[PDB]
């Protein structure tokens, strides 16, 4: 199957935004989150990667608006941000979303995370957001403010636990239009049979073709934010590119 494309809708105060390397001072904005989501659906999206960035940064919630978005969409939503306990996991799932991503809690609450992987299966994926410095692949939590440990040790543990899916970001590529980190993606994909979703850095249709070349190694899809919002290319171009 071709690479699945997931347009990102990253929500700050109800708006679709992007950041450069997850840093608040670099925020660009693209309208209402609901209009963004509906637009990508109109354009052909199979999936929306819907992120509550206020919740990821521990500074607020867009949960009600995200529930509205999920409810209005016909297509599948992968929902994340703030999903750190039983209450917030249930609230997320109660929206009717297809699945969630857990970030911080995989780092800080491994037992909880293992429990929810166990109970929820394919509805729970883990986001592995990686900052690589001098070869050290570190996970980042809490809106990428915190250190969450070594990627490979955590990946190994999650994989052992049965984690359904991993959503992998090179944080230093996220929002940069600098290209995906294909090394990191292949590295993760080669260490798990669980599907991997590539997130961050896409800058061109050729970047998507490049990620597509990894589908056989288990890279199932790619999340695309800035290239779409900035109108580097269109969704149908992208959908067509991954089938070249
Ligand atoms: N500081 C951040 O920006 C950030 N911090 C956490 N998350 C996510 O918050 C959730 C974890 O929350 P929690 O720990 O569980 O509360 C997880 O999903 C974290 O992965 C972020 N999402 C970043 N990009 C969002 C995205 O969708 C890009 O648009 C996409 O990579 C495309 O990038 P592009 O434009 O194409 O380069």
Largest sheet entry: 8 strands, parallel, barrel
CATH class reads: Alpha Beta
Quickly give the CATH architecture: Alpha-Beta Barrel
- The whole-angstrom Rg is 16 Å
Strand arrangement across the biggest beta sheet: 1-4-5-6-7-10-11-12
PDB class: isomerase
Keywords: aromatic amino acid biosynthesis, isomerase, TIM-barrel, histidine biosynthesis, tryptophan biosynthesis
Assembly: monomeric
Entry title: crystal structure of mycobacterium tuberculosis phosphoribosyl isomerase (variant D11N) with bound prfar
Summarize the structure.
This protein has 244 residues and is of the alpha/beta class. It has eleven helices and twelve strands.
